[PDB]
């Protein structure tokens, strides 16, 4: 029962330093079965290292309330434990790159889980150096395994739109150049990279772009996300920066809703993401029903990044109070980008 | 609060043996696990199988009761556990458990009902 | 494969006394562990969650100390209503779900008087 993983390659390879991204969305498996399961790939192109390393999680997970009286209240508590986790989305700084000059290809992998069962979307980022030979690739993680299949597209640069072409421009000088251009919804596919710096004060910027008020932005998370936009010239450091907001105006990814709904709310809670803060620093929200949307986020409020892993609850997302806060650690939805395409 | 199992009459060997356990004068709620817990005369608790108990269905059973025990849900104050190709080895004090979370901190039990698998 | 182990089999302390039962797992629990009552014909007691945490209404004579894969019982000013039989249980959480999950062998407590 083999699942496919689409990938389009544009006619011309090699235009520059670009990768292509490609995604498949898994059937539910066991919870305790997604422990240690690492991507064995058999592609020309070896996995990178840093993929199959330890990332040190923080579980957060609710259980009804284990005093008697107070469980006959139907109320739940949370619990707070060090897990490790292998092949997630984690990436590092200029991993992208780097795996692009060394013809190793980056395949990680989100998980959306309830309390006991996990959906896991399986992503692979290959240069396009793979789309001139385009040798089929197979892929097992876990139960399940994944045929990579390629198709060629008739763009010889661009990203196939509603069968046309389109070309995404770097910065403003080039569209004044240009002189005219074509805005269109792009799908794109991006992950956080957390680098502790001094040129990385995320939030200072985040107030700018929206206004929420986030106070002592110092002692906050540090990093950008970088998003593959598909085809050539994919590669975006950090979004809006004017050189090349909508991934926070639909904070909670591509639209996923359940919509037969055998879904529960069970209620809101509060939990520590470090499990060693002196009180509770997040705030989530407990379900029951079809795992939907991404169980990993990260705490903001620190600068060393709190990667958060949540089964059965719904991160709070929403940076308008700033209280309580997390990031996704992954988004794939649709955003307009300007352009110009033949 | 309380638990109540019925049931657990005398099986001959190879016979089959369905158990039920109720709840009394409280609803079943979403955030509640139904649970069995066999113990024989002179060894300690084991393990059964599980029930959400909820609007979604979901159930784990024991290594050693898997495919010939069957648990589920059958009301909002009731559930089952249907046994099968009892042994002499399941003669035991079954009790019905109510727990936070799967196989988790059991926060109420049951006097228990006794099944006597002989001949 | 999880292994729950509980010792003694048997212990005899006399009133006012002290009780110490050991409940060892194979594989770490992380701190994940409870402690039951039961005495005869009648359905188990909690006393002890989280392997720390005292449950409403049981007395504070009743300690629970232990983390990882090494827990202890201790039952200081003992009574004679508190002759009974003790089990431990090894509870996970998310990922150790079904990884550790067993019961005590169980001991016997008989108070000398």
């Known amino acids: 029962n083999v699942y496919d993983m689409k990938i389009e390659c544009p006619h011309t390879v090699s235009f520059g330093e670009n990768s292509v991204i490609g995604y498949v969305e898994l059937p539910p498996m066991p919870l305790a079965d997604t422990a240690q399961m690492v991507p064995e790939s058999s592609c020309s192109m070896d996995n990178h290292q840093s993929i199959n390393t330890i990332t040190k999680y923080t579980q957060v997970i609710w259980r009804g309330k284990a005093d008697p009286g107070q469980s006959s209240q139907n109320s739940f508590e949370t619990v707070s434990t060090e897990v490790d986790l292998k092949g997630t989305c984690v990436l590092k700084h200029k991993m992208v790159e780097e795996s692009y000059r060394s013809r190793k290809s980056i395949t990680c992998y989100d998980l959306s889980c309830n309390s006991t069962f996990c959906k896991p979307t399986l992503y692979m980022i290959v240069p396009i150096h793979a789309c001139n030979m385009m040798k089929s690739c197979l892929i097992a993680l876990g139960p399940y395994r994944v045929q990579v299949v390629y198709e060629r597209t008739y763009c010889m640069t661009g990203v196939l739109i509603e069968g046309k072409c389109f070309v995404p421009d770097q910065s403003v000088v080039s569209i004044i150049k240009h002189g005219i251009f074509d805005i269109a919804s792009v799908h794109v596919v991006c992950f956080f990279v957390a680098v502790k710096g001094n040129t990385y004060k995320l939030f200072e910027q985040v107030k700018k772009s929206f206004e929420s008020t986030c106070n002592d932005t110092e002692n906050k998370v540090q990093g950008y996300y970088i998003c593959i936009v598909g085809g050539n010239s994919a590669p975006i450091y950090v979004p809006t920066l004017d050189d090349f907001t909508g991934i926070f105006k639909s904070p909670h990814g591509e639209d996923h809703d359940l919509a037969i709904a055998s879904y529960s709310i069970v209620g809101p809670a509060n939990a520590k993401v470090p499990h060693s803060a002196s009180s509770d620093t997040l705030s989530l929200i407990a379900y029951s029903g079809i795992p939907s949307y991404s169980s990993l986020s990260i705490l903001t409020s620190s600068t060393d990044a709190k990667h958060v892993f949540s089964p059965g609850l719904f991160p709070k997302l929403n940076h308008t109070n700033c209280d309580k806060s997390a990031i996704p650690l992954t988004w794939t939805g649709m955003i307009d980008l300007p352009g110009y395409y033949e | 609060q309380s638990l109540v199992e019925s049931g657990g009459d005398l099986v001959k060997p190879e016979g089959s043996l369905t158990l039920t356990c109720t709840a009394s004068g409280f609803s079943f709620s979403s955030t509640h696990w139904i649970c069995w817990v066999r113990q024989a005369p002179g060894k300690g608790l084991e393990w059964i199988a599980c029930?959400?108990?909820?609007?979604?269905?979901?159930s784990y059973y024991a290594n050693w009761a898997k495919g010939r025990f069957t648990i589920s849900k059958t009301s909002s104050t009731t559930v089952t556990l249907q046994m099968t190709t009892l042994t002499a080895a399941d003669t035991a004090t079954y009790f019905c458990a109510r727990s936070g979370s799967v196989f988790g901190v059991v926060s109420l039990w049951g006097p228990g009902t006794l099944v006597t698998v002989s001949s | 494969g999880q292994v729950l182990t509980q010792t003694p089999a048997s212990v005899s302390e006399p009133v006012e006394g002290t009780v110490t039962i050991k409940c060892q797992a194979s594989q770490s629990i992380n701190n994940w562990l409870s402690w039951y009552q039961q005495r005869p014909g009648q359905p188990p007691k909690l006393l002890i969650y989280?392997?720390?945490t005292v449950a409403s209404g049981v007395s504070s004579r009743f300690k629970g100390s232990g983390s990882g894969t090494e827990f202890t019982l201790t039952i200081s000013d003992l009574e004679c209503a508190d002759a009974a039989t003790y089990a431990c249980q090894s509870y996970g959480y998310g990922i150790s779900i079904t990884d550790n999950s067993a019961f005590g062998g169980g001991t016997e407590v008989v108070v000398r008087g």
């Open positions: 989280d392997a720390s």
């Open positions: 029930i959400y108990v909820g609007n979604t269905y979901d």
